[PDB]
Design a protein around this ligand. Structure first.
Ligand SMILES: [Mn+2]
Length: 740
């Protein structure tokens, strides 16, 4: 019956931080009638939950991801979601190995299943790897923006911005035709039903690609195709031009999430770039099972089984290739790891803003920065980035001390658009035409295709879209800031969305508001003009642009996309608060294990918690929760103003130290506020204890630094050892003891 806040237990860095912060949260929220429950969505937990039949009664655990998904569609849900692993196969195997060493008899991951058991096992493991969590929890749209506190702090403490030259040779390179953008076709579903996706080959034959896909009334579905011939010709031409202009060739895709389309596109780029070597050694590469879609790094891993004489020859022919091609942007120049080694190394949402901020440059083989030709094949979003680059060439770097802000209202509920296209993406087996028909046999979408092409279909439902418009009007009204819908009338999909947006906007009183619809490129130019004059503009966009813009603007404005709000007003009425948009920082864990220092910044957790408390306070009419939220806002502001966030080496406060300061400031705020006497009385002694013991506590926390830390594991560490290491201050622990 007590109102609950679900706190996700995740992986690596945030997981460690949670052992320190969660106890604090529980202690501060207890007296206000709030309960905090955890749900395990860690890679290891999701693996264990999936194979109960291979486990002892005591090893089994509840399937918390499924539980959360159900919760996300309930009216009173209140979830705080921290960053987590979207596992690569290597991470998956590593986690499986660790668990087996711990006694969990999980089956091995079979990369090439040849038995009923292996096939069943691989299918299940495949649903666990990759971006498995977000699609389940995101049952609402996105309200992502940096808090005013963070913006104001950035304004006063400007981060470094690479200077821009009007002579910069950097730019985005995209196809002119033959891409998804140029072939998009859409249809508006009239009534409930389902569609069939079939390939009608030239040889007359027919192949069902996906027999059934349920569709709702008012749902928008669209098909598009990336032409293999056009992509290859585009790549070949850009390779030559990069070499001619003397710039680094870089590639910006979203391989981990766009698990079907992007690795294929990545592979086609790798194939054309290294064609002389790959063709020459075609037979032996097939023999060792080389998978070009997994990058050239896959070749280096698999050739280690061939005679040393062969490895030598192959590696030499690869070097001959590099001498004939333009230089590649590097992920790690010292180790010779290029942009083409691993598909998941360079991720477009973070890589493009990083490049734009750093003078439009990337690392070259020499370990220095150089201008670059950023390849983003498809035209749908490539233009947005080009506009930013041109803006910087003409106006110079952005000025964090005066620039405005561009928050985002994004459409993502129910795996909207590209995010739910994976099971409807197919590499075409043979020339023909793909047809999408409904149950009555009506032809909804028809696309001519060639063998090797990438065909895909996306879906966008009406309820998500109406809620998305509602959210946009809400934000515009709350901030009295102009809002712009980024929709391209030339795209069949966007055109269908525009029709809905124009209709739904009429469902609101927008009299004193400034709302408009512009194509992505026009929207970008409009927003950048306003941002440089210090004005704000709300970007209202689809799922992918939500992803891109919420990394892009925070990077320019704040120098980081790790300090902000990612509020998800669940369509069922609940609230989901994501603490961070990034990864779980494996490197932070490495430093912690090596020298007992955790540099993870929990600011996002503090921000999300305040939003969660406010949500609970309003939903349950709990006055104390609202006071807890207000005082936490103050404490978080002091963390920023008094510079109590983690440092980087050893000696200074780390993640644990920042949590102490949060507790200190929060308790002090609670003891001084005049809205709730019971909380004031209760936290007076707590504030005194933390205040009087600041030096002693900070010292005990610092004493836990400087030595190796062993928590008996990585993906599934011993909880007692981890808890001990993350809560080393007996004085701090004792100070919160009275809390109930
Ligand atoms: Mn992102």
């Amino acid at each position: 019956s007590t109102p609950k806040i679900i706190y996700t237990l995740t992986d690596e860095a945030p997981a460690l931080a949670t052992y320190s912060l969660l106890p604090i949260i529980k202690a501060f929220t207890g007296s206000s009638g709030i309960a905090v429950e955890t749900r395990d969505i860690s890679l290891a937990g999701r693996l264990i939950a999936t194979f109960p039949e291979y486990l002892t009664d005591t090893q089994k655990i509840s399937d918390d991801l499924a539980e959360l998904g159900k919760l996300a569609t309930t009216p009173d849900a209140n979830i705080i979601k921290l960053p987590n692993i979207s596992a690569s196969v290597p991470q998956l195997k590593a986690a499986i190995k660790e668990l087996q060493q711990q006694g969990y008899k999980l089956p091995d991951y079979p990369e090439e299943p040849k038995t009923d058991t292996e096939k069943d096992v691989k299918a299940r493991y495949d649903k666990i790897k990759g971006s498995a969590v977000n699609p389940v929890l995101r049952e609402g749209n996105s309200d992502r923006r940096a808090p005013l506190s963070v913006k104001n702090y950035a304004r006063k403490h400007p981060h470094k911005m690479g200077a821009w030259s009007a002579d910069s040779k950097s730019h985005v390179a995209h196809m002119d035709n033959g891409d998804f953008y140029g072939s998009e076709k859409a249809a508006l579903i009239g009534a409930p039903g389902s569609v069939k996706i079939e390939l009608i080959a030239k040889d007359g034959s027919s192949t069902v690609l996906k027999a059934k896909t349920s569709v709702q009334a008012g749902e928008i579905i669209d098909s598009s195709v990336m032409s293999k011939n056009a992509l290859r010709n585009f790549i070949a031409a850009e390779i030559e031009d990069a070499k001619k202009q003397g710039v680094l060739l870089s590639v910006h895709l979203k391989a981990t999430m766009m698990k079907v389309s992007d690795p294929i596109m990545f592979g086609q780029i790798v194939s054309e770039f290294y064609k002389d070597a790959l063709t020459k050694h075609a037979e032996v590469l097939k023999q060792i099972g080389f998978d070009v879609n997994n990058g050239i790094g896959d070749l280096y891993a698999r050739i280690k089984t061939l005679p040393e004489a062969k490895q030598k020859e192959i590696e030499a022919d690869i070097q001959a290739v590099y001498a004939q091609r333009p230089q590649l942007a590097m992920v790690n120049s010292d180790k010779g790891i290029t942009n083409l080694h691993v598909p998941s190394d360079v991720i477009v949402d973070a890589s493009m803003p990083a490049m734009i901020r750093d003078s439009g440059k990337m690392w070259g083989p020499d370990g220095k920065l150089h201008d670059t030709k950023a390849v983003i094949p498809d035209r749908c979003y490539a233009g947005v980035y080009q506009v930013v680059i041109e803006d910087c060439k003409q106006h110079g770097a952005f000025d964090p001390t005066t620039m405005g802000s561009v928050p985002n209202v994004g459409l993502m509920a129910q795996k909207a658009e590209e995010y739910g296209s994976h099971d409807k993406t197919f590499q075409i087996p043979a020339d023909g035409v793909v047809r999408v028909t409904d149950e009555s046999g009506k032809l909804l979408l028809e696309q001519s295709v060639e063998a090797g092409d990438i065909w895909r279909m996306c879906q966008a439902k009406d309820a998500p879209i109406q809620d998305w418009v509602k959210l946009a009007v809400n934000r515009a009204r709350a901030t009295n800031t102009p809002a712009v819908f980024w929709l391209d009338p030339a795209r069949a999909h966007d055109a269908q969305v525009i029709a809905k947006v124009e209709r739904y906007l009429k469902d609101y009183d927008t009299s004193g508001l400034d709302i408009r619809i512009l194509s992505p490129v026009e929207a970008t130019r409009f927003s950048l003009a306003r941002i440089r004059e210090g004005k704000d503009t709300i970007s209202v966009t689809g799922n992918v642009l939500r992803d891109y813009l919420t990394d892009l603007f925070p990077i320019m404005e704040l120098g980081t996309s790790a300090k902000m709000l990612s509020i998800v007003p669940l369509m069922s009425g609940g609230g989901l608060f994501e603490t961070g948009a990034g990864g779980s920082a494996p490197k932070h864990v490495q430093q912690f294990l090596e020298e007992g220092y955790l540099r993870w910044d929990s600011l996002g957790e503090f921000l999300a918690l305040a939003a969660s408390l406010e949500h609970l306070g309003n939903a349950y009419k709990n006055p104390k929760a609202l006071v807890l939220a207000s005082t936490l806002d103050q404490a978080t502001g002091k963390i920023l103003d008094n510079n109590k966030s983690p440092a980087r080496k050893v000696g200074e406060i780390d993640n644990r130290g920042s949590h102490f300061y949060l507790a200190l400031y929060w308790a002090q705020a609670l003891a001084a506020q005049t809205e709730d006497k019971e909380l004031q009385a209760q936290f007076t002694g707590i504030a005194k204890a933390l205040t009087d013991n600041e030096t002693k506590i900070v010292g005990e926390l610092a004493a836990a630094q400087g030595k190796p830390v062993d928590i008996a594991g990585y993906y599934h560490p011993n909880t007692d050892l981890t808890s001990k290491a993350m809560r080393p201050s007996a004085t701090f622990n004792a100070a919160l003891a009275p809390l109930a």
